[PDB]
Amino acid sequence: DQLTEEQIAEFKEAFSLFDKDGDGTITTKELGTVMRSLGQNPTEAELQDMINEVDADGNGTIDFPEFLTMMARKMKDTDSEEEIREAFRVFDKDGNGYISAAELRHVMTNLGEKLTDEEVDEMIREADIDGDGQVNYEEFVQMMTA
């Protein structure tokens, strides 16, 4: 690892705040009680979403290798991933993890500078890598990242 010893110690100390039980993993109850202490009252679905948006292996728990990566992003001020994923829910009137043609049409051809039906269709075709009508989050992120 490129990090020094002091940084590793600081990150381990920060992790120990959430992993108070000492098991070595973070579960829903610990995050829930930390949020309760902070003042919020999260729901089960919200806790599950916030604990699943970070883990990569999929075991349902978060450990240090999957926590250092998350901590590497919250330190910087000007984020460019949360503000991209939060421009996805606004457009997402479908209710699923996809964007339909009508949503893009009535959100873009009207708001701001009015677009055209041909331009909207071209954008939908370009975004639809697989050719399906719906647009997944992967194609969305790829299109905006370029």
Binding site: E83, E86, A87, V90, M108, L111, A146
Partner: protein
Amino acid sequence: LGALRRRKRLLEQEKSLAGWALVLAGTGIGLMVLHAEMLWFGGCSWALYLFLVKCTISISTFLLLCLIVAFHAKEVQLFMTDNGLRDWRVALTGRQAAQIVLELVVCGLHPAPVRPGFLGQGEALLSLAMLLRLYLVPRAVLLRSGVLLNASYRSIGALNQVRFRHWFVAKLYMNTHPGRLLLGLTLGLWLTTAWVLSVAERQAVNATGHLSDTLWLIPITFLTIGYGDVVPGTMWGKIVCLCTGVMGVCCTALLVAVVARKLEFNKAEKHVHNFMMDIQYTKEMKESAARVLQEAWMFYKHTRRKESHAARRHQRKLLAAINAFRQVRLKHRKLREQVNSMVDISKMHMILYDLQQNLS
């Protein structure tokens, strides 16, 4: 049940006496300014009109000295009926006798008609001691308010154990309309003091102090904006100014408190304000997201054609559209906490659900 009659009759009688014991005091105070000012703007020319007034201000006091005694006799006669006694030697304590004697001597000081224009030392104090007859106002106001006679108002007050005195009526009048009382009191204290300060610094050789200068001096001291153009020059004029300053320091704060309190919102418009701000934010976010996405698409399409500066311009615009979107999102998220915590909404729904569960 003759008590409920012998109480109403006595209460009405003593109310009439307490209301008629104020006109005489008002006339007595009034017939002193017309004597002092006449002696100032006069002298040996008016030698009989300075005797007629000083003889009338004794006839106008010999009746007050009897009205007070009649009222204090009726109060004892009412106390005897209240306790159902028979001998009047029991109902009188020592404190009541002290109060009666003090009232008799306080309401019996006046310039005695036992007689170059100056109020000689010795009777100026007596004349200025006739302003102590203002303790009769609360006694003649409480008996006339009419809250001591309602039958539907002494039982609700009995259940909550509250007693009606000179303070409850004062609080009621203060809280019915506080601005009028202050605006009518600060214009009375600025005028009943400008004459007491004038009588203590009248100068014959020149106009060192009179009603032309005190009317300018008193408000300046009251507002603590003391300039220094005119200052008092007598031991008796250097205490009235201190009293005026002490009163003003409190009156100004009492006024500014009400002025600040008036401008605030009530509980029936803040909710509407929050709702209509949420309606605006939920479309500002939609406005910003579309610009972000279309700028991204423009950048992609221009860089697909090996452009040089179009891609740079589009990227630079994107990096500010993202910041604007972030700011708007943060504002909306902050306001949602207030609209879901201040008006409760969820708490009211939970209370209704708990009530429904208790019912069934």
